[PDB]
Amino acid sequence: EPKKVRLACLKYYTIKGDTAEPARHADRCHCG
Amino acid sequence: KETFKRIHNLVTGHRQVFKYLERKRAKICFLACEEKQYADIVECLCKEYHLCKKFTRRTLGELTGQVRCIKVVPASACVIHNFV
Amino acid sequence: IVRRDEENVYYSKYLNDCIMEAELHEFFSRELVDAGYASCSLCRTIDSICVIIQCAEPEVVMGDNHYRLHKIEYLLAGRFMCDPKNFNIWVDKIIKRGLSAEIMVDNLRAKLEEAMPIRRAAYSIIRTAMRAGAAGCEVIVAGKLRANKFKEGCLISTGHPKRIFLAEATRHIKMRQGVIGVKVRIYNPNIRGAVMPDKIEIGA
Amino acid sequence: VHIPKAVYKAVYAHLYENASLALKEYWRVGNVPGITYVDENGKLCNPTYLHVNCIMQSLESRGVVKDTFAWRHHYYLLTEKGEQFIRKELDLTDDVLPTPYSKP
Amino acid sequence: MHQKYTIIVVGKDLKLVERYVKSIVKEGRAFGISGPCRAPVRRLTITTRKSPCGEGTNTWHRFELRMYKRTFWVTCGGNDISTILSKTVVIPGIQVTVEVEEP
Amino acid sequence: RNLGSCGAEDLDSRVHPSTIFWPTEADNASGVPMRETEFCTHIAHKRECRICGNYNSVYRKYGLFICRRCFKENAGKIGFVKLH
Numbered sequence A: 001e002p003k004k005v006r007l008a009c010l011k012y013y014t015i016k017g018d019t020a021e022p023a024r025h026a027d028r029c030h031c032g
Numbered sequence B: 001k002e003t004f005k006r007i008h009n010l011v012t013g014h015r016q017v018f019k020y021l022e023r024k025r026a027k028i029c030f031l032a033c034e035e036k037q038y039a040d041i042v043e044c045l046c047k048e049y050h051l052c053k054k055f056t057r058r059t060l061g062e063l064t065g066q067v068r069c070i071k072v073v074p075a076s077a078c079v080i081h082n083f084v
Numbered sequence C: 001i002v003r004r005d006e007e008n009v010y011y012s013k014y015l016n017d018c019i020m021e022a023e024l025h026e027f028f029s030r031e032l033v034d035a036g037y038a039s040c041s042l043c044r045t046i047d048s049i050c051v052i053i054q055c056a057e058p059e060v061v062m063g064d065n066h067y068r069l070h071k072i073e074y075l076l077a078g079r080f081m082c083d084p085k086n087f088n089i090w091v092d093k094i095i096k097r098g099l100s101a102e103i104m105v106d107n108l109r110a111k112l113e114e115a116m117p118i119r120r121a122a123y124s125i126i127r128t129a130m131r132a133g134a135a136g137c138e139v140i141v142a143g144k145l146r147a148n149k150f151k152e153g154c155l156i157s158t159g160h161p162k163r164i165f166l167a168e169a170t171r172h173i174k175m176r177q178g179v180i181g182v183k184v185r186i187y188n189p190n191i192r193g194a195v196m197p198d199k200i201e202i203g204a
Numbered sequence D: 001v002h003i004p005k006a007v008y009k010a011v012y013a014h015l016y017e018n019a020s021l022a023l024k025e026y027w028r029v030g031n032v033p034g035i036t037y038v039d040e041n042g043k044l045c046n047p048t049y050l051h052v053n054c055i056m057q058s059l060e061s062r063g064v065v066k067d068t069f070a071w072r073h074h075y076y077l078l079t080e081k082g083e084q085f086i087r088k089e090l091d092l093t094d095d096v097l098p099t100p101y102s103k104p
Numbered sequence E: 001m002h003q004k005y006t007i008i009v010v011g012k013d014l015k016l017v018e019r020y021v022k023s024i025v026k027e028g029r030a031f032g033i034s035g036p037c038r039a040p041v042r043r044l045t046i047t048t049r050k051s052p053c054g055e056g057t058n059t060w061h062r063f064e065l066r067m068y069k070r071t072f073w074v075t076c077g078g079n080d081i082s083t084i085l086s087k088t089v090v091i092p093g094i095q096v097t098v099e100v101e102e103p
Numbered sequence F: 001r002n003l004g005s006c007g008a009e010d011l012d013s014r015v016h017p018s019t020i021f022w023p024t025e026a027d028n029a030s031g032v033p034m035r036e037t038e039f040c041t042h043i044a045h046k047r048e049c050r051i052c053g054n055y056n057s058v059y060r061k062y063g064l065f066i067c068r069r070c071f072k073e074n075a076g077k078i079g080f081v082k083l084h
């Protein structure tokens, strides 16, 4: 029964809309 | 307003607009809101890449299929990926 | 001299089509009751089956330009996986309705469910048959009301002639208190101009 | 439960074009040999029995079609209300009419 | 032209299956169609208890279904595919009396 | 677990990929491959009367697949006749 957190605007890995990205070990969307 | 209903038969949400604004899969953009960090993100991402702003945030809830008929819900979005 | 596994296809091909039909009889009974369906058949065509039916009210089965019949036509196709269009149902009509057990039993069942009691319906049915040229009928109604029978004239109930002359039918009625088992039997000794045994004549 | 929209549209279209769905009583794992759908799969992929069974149940419960069961085969048939509702989901116009009306 | 065609008649009822051949041979009066081989009857058999619950004296139903069949391979190529259709039309229409033609 | 496995020396003991010999009877369901992992992984024939969904007392002779009890009701139409 895992829980969830309110979504925040963290995907912005930059400092001025520089789209840096399109976390322990590696992982990709889905399982591959 | 008229044929848009044909299209819905498009996306809404930050997690699904970004995922279609970039990679140039999008179409047209219509901003809104509450916080700049959600206004000057896309707009700046609109600065790179179409970019438009619709007068009201509610009609998006209306134009889109976020209702059941009676309970329109606001929802800013800017990705017309389908555009069939 | 001959191989016994070649003709097995022809033998097995004829048996499958027999069952392919009984399902049709069941389905029609569950659906085209409104037109009082009686019986069906089959005729494997080059690319389809020429099923013909017999229903007292032909008009009810078909619709506007047979529209609902066309509707049914496609349905069967998918169920049996045959090409549509090639399907070609045919519709027939029964003349002496007072000589068939099934239409009478269905009408009687409907009447019973019209709040009218057993006696009036049974006597209406027997009158309808006798006025339609029948030696005799017999109406039996069993359920939560025992068995209350009604009969008019002479019937046979034993021997080979029974299966060909006597025609019987049965139904079930779902009434609030329970189930009303109802059946009917009619004995026509002039069917298809067949001479009943031990029936003789001498002349001058 | 998470039934794809492509399946919804495929079933609606198949129903209206044929006016008749001849379905088998089943509740285990297996796809339907008839209706079909494509989702960037490269080859039209058939639907699953659970999905179509739930969809049919919802539709009939809503009064769009009626059914007989016979033995081992749900036979369905869409009513006038059926033609009046599918055309909306397929996004059709009232002029169009089911195929069977065209001399089967 | 010539195809070494075959005629096969399969059915259950002895009455029609015997009357239909008479019409066929009439139609083949001049095309040389001749006697048919009558195969041994395939008497399928099934037995079952008469009681759904198995009470009382053990009794048994005995139903059987026969499969009469006849073959008119006589035509062979003696007739043309043109009138092989003619062979298949002038014949009466019996509701159930399956038939098939092969070379 | 898609990035794991056992020792190679053990892999030699893998069951022969030769298809299993225990199929399921289909009288006429397309053969296609969470709870889905084991909803009905166990594989076994399910021959049953094609009239009543009952798996008990079914004749397989001549490819009928009819319950013995439900046989009497429809035998008259199916063609079987009671003589001798």
Ligand SMILES: [Zn+2]
Binding pocket: F049, F051, F052, F054, F066, F067, F068, F069, F070, F071
């Ligand atoms: Zn059964």
